[PDB]
Amino acid sequence: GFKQDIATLRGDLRTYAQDIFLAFLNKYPDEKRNFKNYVGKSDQELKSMAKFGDHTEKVFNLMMEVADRATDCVPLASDASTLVQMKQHSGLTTGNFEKLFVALVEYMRASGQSFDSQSWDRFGKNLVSALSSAGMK
Numbered sequence: 336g337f338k339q340d341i342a343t344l345r346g347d348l349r350t351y352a353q354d355i356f357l358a359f360l361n362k363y364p365d366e367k368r369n370f371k372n373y374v375g376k377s378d379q380e381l382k383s384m385a386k387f388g389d390h391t392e393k394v395f396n397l398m399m400e401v402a403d404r405a406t407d408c409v410p411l412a413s414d415a416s417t418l419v420q421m422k423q424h425s426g427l428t429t430g431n432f433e434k435l436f437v438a439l440v441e442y443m444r445a446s447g448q449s450f451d452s453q454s455w456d457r458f459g460k461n462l463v464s465a466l467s468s469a470g471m472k
């Protein structure tokens with residue numbers, strides 16, 4: 336289930352962090368509007384670019400801590416506040432987060448693996464609600 340999935344993802348974190356973010360950017364090409372540096376690059380090129388590797392691993396590190404601190408796929412209000420109050424997310428709306436989690440869930444569905452995709456889908460919808468509650472537009 337959800338907790339084991341966090342351990343699975345952490346066990347190959349750099350490869351999952353990259354592959355899931357790339358699934359997000361390729362499913363939602365207009366999301367590159369927040370990532371000008373990424374435009375006109377193939378996956379393999381992105382995975383050579385220093386800000387890409389470092390950003391993707393920092394997102395997935397923090398994602399997994401918020402998932403690990405959740406109860407029944409419901410994130411802490413404190414983690415939602417932190418995410419809202421981040422200077423880097425100045426531009427962002429919950430729709431950015433909804434899309435990341437749709438891609439994650441669809442990546443998990445297509446994997447050969449026994450990920451609890453139901454629980455990640457629930458986690459993403461609960462995170463979006465929390466973010467709204469904490470001030471994100």
Ligand code: HEM
Pocket residue numbers: 366369370386389390393394395397398401423424427431432435
């Ligand atoms: C659970 C979900 C997410 C977590 C935990 C998270 C976490 C983080 C963290 C820790 C940073 C700081 C990275 C750094 O600059 O060192 C960051 C930066 C950033 N995040 Fe997020 N993030 C999430 C979702 C999103 C989404 C969905 C977007 C855009 C669609 C986004 C866009 C950014 C951008 C643009 C930056 C800084 C500029 C750059 O990418 O280089 N984040 N995020």
Ligand SMILES: Oc1c(F)cccc1F
Pocket residue numbers: 397401413414415417418
């Ligand atoms: O505690 C944190 C951070 F330090 C960064 C992003 C999200 C989060 F919940």
